[PDB]
């Protein structure tokens, strides 16, 4: 049964600190509490460790990710540029 229609996970905060601030904290709390697909063991056990650190459940292979998601879009752009400069004309 759907109980909250707008606040979602932010209903633990209740009536305080503004609709816009709660709306902007909603997406990133979903991002920090969502389980991500592990790229190594193929499971969905990426549990959030401390900030910047992501930790898969099985196979214990700790990865250094973003502060709120698993891959920052800027970080993916940096990785694409680094591999492009890698295979660009052999350094």
């Amino acid at each position: 049964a759907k109980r909250t229609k707008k606040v979602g996970i932010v209903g633990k905060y209740g009536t305080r600190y503004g609709a816009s601030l709660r709306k902007m904290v909603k997406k990133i709390e979903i991002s920090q509490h969502a389980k991500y697909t592990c790229s190594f063991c193929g499971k969905t056990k990426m549990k959030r460790r401390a900030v910047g650190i992501w930790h898969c459940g099985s196979c214990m292979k700790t990865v250094a990710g973003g502060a709120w998601t698993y891959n920052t879009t800027s970080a993916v752009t940096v990785k694409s540029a680094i591999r492009r400069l890698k295979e660009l004309k052999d350094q």
Partner: protein
């Protein structure tokens, strides 16, 4: 290359319903030791120790090796079952020619 990938998926679809196959590392080990397996299929992101061990067993037993450019989730999708799989061995292809085309 997409013709080759769709060919590999179609051959796996044929082996799924017509051929005889085993699933998983501990079940492919018995086949690669008994020599019943002819072709083995590795995932992209299987761990490198298990990958090197299966490659070493296959080049001892004269068994074709095929790497699968894809996560084990879509390798399980390609073999048509809802779980995931990292290692396959086609011990008897029914109507396919994976053991004929690639080696």
């Amino acid at each position: 290359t997409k013709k080759s990938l769709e060919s590999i998926n179609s051959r796996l679809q044929l082996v799924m319903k017509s051929g005889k196959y085993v699933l998983g590392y501990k079940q492919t080990l018995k086949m690669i030791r008994q020599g019943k397996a002819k072709l083995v299929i590795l995932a992209n992101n299987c761990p490198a120790l298990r990958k090197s061990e299966i490659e070493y067993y296959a080049m001892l037993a004269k068994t074709g090796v095929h790497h699968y450019s894809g996560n084990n989730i879509e390798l399980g999708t390609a073999c048509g079952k809802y779980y995931r799989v990292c290692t396959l061995a086609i011990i008897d292809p029914g109507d396919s020619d994976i053991i004929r085309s690639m080696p």
